[PDB]
Write a protein that binds this ligand. Sequence first.
Ligand SMILES: O=c1nc[nH]c2c1ncn2[C@H]1C[C@H](O)[C@@H](COP(=O)(O)OP(=O)(O)OP(=O)(O)O)O1
Ligand SMILES: O=c1nc[nH]c2c1ncn2[C@H]1C[C@H](O)[C@@H](COP(=O)(O)OP(=O)(O)OP(=O)(O)O)O1
Ligand SMILES: NC(=O)c1cccnc1
Ligand SMILES: NC(=O)c1cccnc1
Ligand SMILES: NC(=O)c1cccnc1
Ligand SMILES: NC(=O)c1cccnc1
Ligand SMILES: [Zn+2]
Ligand SMILES: [Zn+2]
Lengths: 180, 180, 277, 277, 277, 277
Amino acid sequence: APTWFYNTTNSEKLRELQHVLGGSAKLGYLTAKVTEILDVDLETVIRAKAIAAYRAVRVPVIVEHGALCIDALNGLPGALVKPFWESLDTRLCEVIPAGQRTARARGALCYCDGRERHVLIEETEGEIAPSARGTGGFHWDPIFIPKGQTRTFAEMSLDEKLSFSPLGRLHTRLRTELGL
Amino acid sequence: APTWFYNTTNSEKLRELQHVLGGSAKLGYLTAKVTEILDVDLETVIRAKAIAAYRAVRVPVIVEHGALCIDALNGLPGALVKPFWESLDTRLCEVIPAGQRTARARGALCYCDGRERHVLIEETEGEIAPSARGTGGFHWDPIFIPKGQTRTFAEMSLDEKLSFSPLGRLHTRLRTELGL
Amino acid sequence: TTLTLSEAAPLLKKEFREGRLIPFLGAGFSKPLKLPDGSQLIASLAKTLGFEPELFDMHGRFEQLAEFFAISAPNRLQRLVYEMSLSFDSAEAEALREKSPMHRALAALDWRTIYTTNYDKHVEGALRDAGKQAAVLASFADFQGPRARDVCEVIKFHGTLDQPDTIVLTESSYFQRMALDAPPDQRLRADLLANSFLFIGYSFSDTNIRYIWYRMNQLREQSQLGVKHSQARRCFFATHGAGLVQPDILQQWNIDVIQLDPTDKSASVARLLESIA
Amino acid sequence: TTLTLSEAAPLLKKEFREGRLIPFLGAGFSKPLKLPDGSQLIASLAKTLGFEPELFDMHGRFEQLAEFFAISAPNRLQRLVYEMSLSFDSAEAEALREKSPMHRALAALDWRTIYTTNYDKHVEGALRDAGKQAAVLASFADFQGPRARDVCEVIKFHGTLDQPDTIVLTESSYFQRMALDAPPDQRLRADLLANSFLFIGYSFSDTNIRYIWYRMNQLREQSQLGVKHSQARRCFFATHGAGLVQPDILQQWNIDVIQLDPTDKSASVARLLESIA
Amino acid sequence: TTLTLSEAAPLLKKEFREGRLIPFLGAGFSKPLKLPDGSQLIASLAKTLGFEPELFDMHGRFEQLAEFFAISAPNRLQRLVYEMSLSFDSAEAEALREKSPMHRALAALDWRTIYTTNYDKHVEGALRDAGKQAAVLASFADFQGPRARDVCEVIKFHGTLDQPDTIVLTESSYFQRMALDAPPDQRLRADLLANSFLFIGYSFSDTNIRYIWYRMNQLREQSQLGVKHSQARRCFFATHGAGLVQPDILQQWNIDVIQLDPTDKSASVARLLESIA
Amino acid sequence: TTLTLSEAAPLLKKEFREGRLIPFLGAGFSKPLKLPDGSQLIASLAKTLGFEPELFDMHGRFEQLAEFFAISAPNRLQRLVYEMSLSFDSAEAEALREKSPMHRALAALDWRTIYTTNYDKHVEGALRDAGKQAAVLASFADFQGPRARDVCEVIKFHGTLDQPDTIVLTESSYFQRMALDAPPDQRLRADLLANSFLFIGYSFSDTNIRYIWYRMNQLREQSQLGVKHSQARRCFFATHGAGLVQPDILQQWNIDVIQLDPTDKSASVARLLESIA
Ligand SMILES: O=c1nc[nH]c2c1ncn2[C@H]1C[C@H](O)[C@@H](COP(=O)(O)OP(=O)(O)OP(=O)(O)O)O1
Ligand SMILES: O=c1nc[nH]c2c1ncn2[C@H]1C[C@H](O)[C@@H](COP(=O)(O)OP(=O)(O)OP(=O)(O)O)O1
Ligand SMILES: NC(=O)c1cccnc1
Ligand SMILES: NC(=O)c1cccnc1
Ligand SMILES: NC(=O)c1cccnc1
Ligand SMILES: NC(=O)c1cccnc1
Ligand SMILES: [Zn+2]
Ligand SMILES: [Zn+2]
C-alpha cells in the first residue's frame, strides 16, 4: 500500500509524474478538486493548496501548482496562469510586445503529511514564442521556448520536455526527500 | 445599534459608501481581512467572499468585490483586478492595443445574514484611457473613461464619480432591499 | 504505530474463533449503498429550513444543527424519519446490497452480536440475504421479546427507523444517552467487559461512544493490573483516513488502528472481512 | 427574538436587588488583558509539538488536541501550567487590569458568588483592586477551608493555576467532569436551582456546561409546571456574535440572549455592568 | 591557607582543558537577578503565616520553617511554587540576565555538565542567550528522555519550578534525599568519582551535599592511597565570605577555598570564569 | 494542642503498666548536676582554641565546631574525653545525684530499657543508688557480653566516657551514624516499632534522631492504615520551652508535647515521673 498520494485533477499532469515516479510502489494517486487562493506568488498559492487538499483526502498528500511569470507583464500571470490560458488561448502570444518576450516557467511541489508543509520549487528561464507551434503536451506548451533551445515544450517528446521543464528536476528532489 | 455591517479593509471604499449610505443608523462598519478564491467570474468570487467574511465576524455582513473585464484581454482580469494594478500600474494602458480599448467596469455587493447570500451586480461600459490622467479617487481610476464621458473616474469628484460608477446604482438597491 | 491488513489478520482470527470478536458498524459501512453520511443529512436539513448548506454548517456541530431542525416547527422530526425511511430502506438500496462485497463478506461469518449506529435495515438485511436470520434489538420491548435460540443479535445502538422513538439524532437525545441507562447502553458496557470490538466504517465523533471507552479504563486503571496484563485485550479500528491526533488518543483506551488502502474503500474492507474467515 | 441592552437592564436590576443574580465569566472576559483565548493556546501547543498551527487545528476539537499534547511526553502538562501561570498572571496583565473598564464595573457591584471558567487571577484580582476581598474556591480543601463571614466567593469552575490538579483542559478531564461529582459541579447545580445567571464573555462550547443546563430542564419538565410558571426564572447570555442556531437551542433551557454592540466589545460589556447598578 | 584568584586560575585551566571541571551553582549566583536567597524566602513565608520575620526565624532552621509552612493548610506548598515561578522566572529577571557579566562568562565556556541547587531557568537560560543549547535534567523522565548528541546537561539538583514534585524545600524532602537514591543524587556521586567541581555562589549549608562529600572520603580512605595520591584530585570553593571554621572542615574532603574580592561580588566571580578561558 | 501534666498522666500509666514505655533522656536531665549542656562545651572548646566564646559560636553549628576542634591538633579529641570524664563524673556530681529529685523519681520506677544521649554515668548511677542494678550497653562488645536475667538495660545512644571510641560529638561522627548501622541505632529502630517513648530533658536538635522518626513514618504511611489506627501509638515529649514551630513538626511523627511548668524545671520533671507510678 502507498504512503504518499499525489493529488491532481489534471490527467495530463498524471501521465507526466507517472512517467518518472511511476515505478515507485510507495506513491498513490488521488483526484480531489481544490480551490486556489487569489495571489500571484507561487509560494503562497502552493502552500495554501496543500492545506486545502489534506483537508479533503486526510492522507499524506502531494500537490502541484505552477507559474508563468512574464517580464512584459511585470510577472503576470504568476500563479494566475490557469485562467489566462482559458481566456487568452493563443492571443497570449499577441498581447506581449515583440522584442521583450522573456518569461520564467516556475513550478512547485508541496507535500503535507498532516503536520508540516514543505515546498520544492524549480524554475526554467525562457521566452514566449511569436506564435503557437507544436502538438504534444498540454496547456501553454505550444507558446513557451526554453533558453538555448529553439523548440517549444509542445514540439518535444515527454523525455525531452522533462529535460527542460521544472518537473524534471522536481522528480529527484521529491524522490530523495520522501524515499520513493 | 447597527444590524448590518459593511466589511472592507480598503479605506477608500469606506469613504465612498459612507458618502451615500453614511447617514443610515442601521449600518455598521468592520475591517476584517478575507482571502478571495482564484476565479475570473465576479459572481463566483463575491459569493465565496461573503461566506468567508461571515465566518470571520459572525454578524450580518455586506462585502464588495469588483471586476475590470477588458475586450482586448478577452475579459481579463475580471475579478483578478487586485493583482493587476499591483503589478501593472500604468503599463496597463500600454499592454492593450490602441483601437480596441473597450472594457467593462463591473462591481458587486453580496450581503449574508447567516442563512442566505444575495448578490447585487451593476456594471459600467467604458474604455481604457491612452494614458493615466487624474489625481482623485484610488486604484485604476486614472485609467477608466466611461462611455459618453471624456474624463476618467480620477478626474471627477466623488459626487460625479458615483453618477457613473457601479456603486452609485448599488446604493439604492442595497438601501431598498435592506431597509437602511 | 499502526497495524496493516496482513498484520491484523491473525489477531482477528484468534478472537473470532474464540467467539470474542464483535463488529461495530458506522455510517461509512452504508456508503456504497448511495446513502447520506452525517454531512449529506445536514445538507438536506438546510434545504428544508431555507439555509444554504455551507452557511448552515458553520453555526454548530452535527448534534446541534439537528436539534435546531427538530424545534423549528411541530412534527418536524417525525417527517425526517419518514423521509429517511423512504430513502435509506428503498428498493434500489436493497438491490445494491446483495451485490455489495462488504455486506456479503460480513454475512459469510458466523457472528453472534453486531452493533450498528446507522438507521437502516442493511446490516440485518445482509444476514437475511445469506440465508441466515437476525434479531434486531433496539428498544426495551425488543430485549424482552421472544427470539430464537442461536441467532445473531443486531443491536441498533442509535435506533431503528421502524421505531422512531429510539432514534438519537438531536443534541437532547445525545444528552439523554449520557446517563448510560438505555438498553443499548447497558448491553454495550457488558459486552465491552469481555470482548474485542472491530470498528468498521465508523469514526469516533460521538461523545457518548467515547465516554463508554473512557469509563472502561477507569475500571481498568483502578484494578491495578500490570503493564503486561492491562494491555492484553485490544479493540480494533479499521479506517482509511485516520489523522495524526486520533490514533494516539485511542491507544489510551486499548484501541488499535488498522490502516486500510484508501484508493478503493469498499474492496479494502471486504478483504479485511474475508481474512477473518 | 433577542433582548437589547436597554430592554435587559430592568430585568437584571430586579434579580440583582433580590440577590439572585450570579455572573458566569468566560475566556472573552480576559481578552482585553491580551491573553490567549481557546484558539491561541492551540497555536502555542502546535509550536511545541512541531505542527503548523493551521494543520494542527484540523485533527480534532479543542479538548482532543490538548489531550494529544499532554500525552506526547512525560511532564508535558505540568510545563503548560507553569508557562500559562507566567503569561496569564504576569505583572503587565495586572497593570492592564486596573485600567480595564469591565473589571472596574464588575467589582463595583456587591456580588456574593462569581463563577469563572478561565485560569487567571483577574476576576478575584479585580475585587482586590476595588478594596473588596474575595475567596477563591476551586478544590475540596477550599470549600472546607476557613473564609470570612460575608465575602464574595469566586468559584473557579475549571480550576486555578496555583492548584494544577484542578485544571480541566484535556479531553480526559472533561470526561471526568461528566459525572457532575466535582465540588465546583455540585455547587453550580445547587445555585442553578435558585438563581439567574449572567453569561459574560462565554460561549457555550463546553459539553459539561451544556449538560448541566440540560438536566435542569429534566427537573423542570418532570415537575409539570404550567406554560407561565416554567418560563419565569430566566438566565441571560450577553454575546456580541451569537449565530442563528445557538440562540434557539438555549431558549429550551430558559436562557435569553442579550445582543451587545460588536463594534467595541469592551465598552458594550462595561455599559451592561453599569446598568445593573 | 586559601587560594587567591591568580593562584587558582592555572589550576582551573588544566582541569577544564581535560574536560574534568564541573560547575556547581548556588543561590548566590542568582543574587544579581534580584531574587530571594534562603533568607528572603523565610521572610515571605512568615508574612503569609502571620509571623513577624524576625520572630519566625528563631523557631528553627531553614528546612524546618518550610516544613512548618507546607503543613499549615492544604495546598500551601503548591501555591508557593506558583508564586516562586512568577517572581523567579519573570520577564524582568530575564532582562537582567542577558546583561549580567557572570551569566555571560559562564555561557562563554564550553561546559558539558552543570549542577545547580536553585529553582530558576537562569543557568540554562544563560546558555540559550549565548546561542548554545542546554538540556535540563531534574526527574527520572528527563534522564530517560531524548536529548541531542553533544549538549550541556544542566542537572537541577534540587528541582525545577516546571516540575513541582521535584522541588526539595521542606525538611521531609531533605530527609527523603538522605538515601542518595534520587536520579540527581546518583548522577552526582558518579560525577564526583572522576571530576573536579567548582562551587560558585554556594555555601555548604545543605546536610545532603555535605553527606555526599563525606562518603566520597570513606571510599578515599578505605582505598589506602598515599599522602601524595589521595590529595591529588581537588575541588574548588569560590566564596567571598567564608569564615574561620568552614575552610578547615572542607580540607578533609579535598575542597580548596578560592578567596574572591568581597567589595564587588559580581565582578569577582566574572573574572574567575573569564580566567578559565 | 499540647497536653498538660494531669492530662498526660493517665496516658503514661497505661503504657507503663503494659511495659511499653521507654524513657529517652537528654542533656537537660543532667543540668541539676551542674554539668555543661551543648552550649557550655563550645564555650570550653573556644577557650582552648583561643577564640572568644561569642565569636566562635557564629562560625558553624554544634557538630561543626566540635569537628573543627578535633582536627586542630593531634590527640585533641582524646584530651576532651579525659577532661569531660573529670568534670562530668566527678565526686561532687555524684553527691548532687543522690539528693536530686528527678534521679530518685526515675529510679523508683521499674523500667526495662532506658536510652540516653549524654556522656555520664548518672542515669545508670541513679539506678545503683536505689539498690537496683543496671547494664550499660554502648558498643558491639556490650551487646554480646554477659548480663543478668531481668536487669534494666541503659542504652548509651551517643557513647560513654569509659569507651572513648563510641562518643559521637564531631560532625564526621554524626555522618557515620546516618547509615543507622551502629548497634545503638539498630536497637533503637526495633524498640520504636513496638514501644512509646518519653523524651525528658531532650530537644530534637540531632539530625540522626529526627531521621529515625522520619523513617518510621515511611513504614507507617506505606502500610496504609486508617486515620484512626495510624494515630494510636504515640510518643511523648516533655519540654518546658518548646517553641511554635517544633510541636507541629513532631505531630507528623506521632509525638505529643507535654508542657511542663517552666518556673522550676527540676520539680516539674519529678512530678511527671511520680505520676507514672
Ligand atoms: O508543466 C506544465 N506544462 C504544461 N502546462 C502546465 C504545466 N503546469 C501547469 N500547466 C497548466 C495546466 C493548467 O491549465 C495550469 C495550472 O493550473 P492547475 O490549477 O495546476 O491545474 P488543475 O486545477 O486543472 O489541476 P490540479 O488539480 O492539479 O491543480 O497551467
Ligand atoms: O470602484 C472602484 N473604483 C476605483 N478602484 C476600485 C474600485 N473597486 C475596487 N477597486 C480597486 C481596489 C482594489 O485595489 C481592487 C479590488 O480588490 P479588493 O479585494 O476588493 O480590495 P481590498 O482587498 O483591498 O479591500 P476589501 O477587503 O474590501 O476586498 O480594485
Ligand atoms: N442509515 C445510515 O446510513 C445513516 C447515515 C448517517 C447517519 N445515520 C444513519
Ligand atoms: N485564563 C484565560 O484567559 C484562559 C484562556 C483560555 C482558556 N482558559 C483560560
Ligand atoms: N531560584 C533561586 O534563585 C533560589 C534562591 C533561593 C532558594 N531557592 C531558589
Ligand atoms: N554528660 C552531659 O551532661 C553532656 C552534656 C552535653 C553533651 N553531651 C553530654
Ligand atoms: Zn487547480
Ligand atoms: Zn481583498
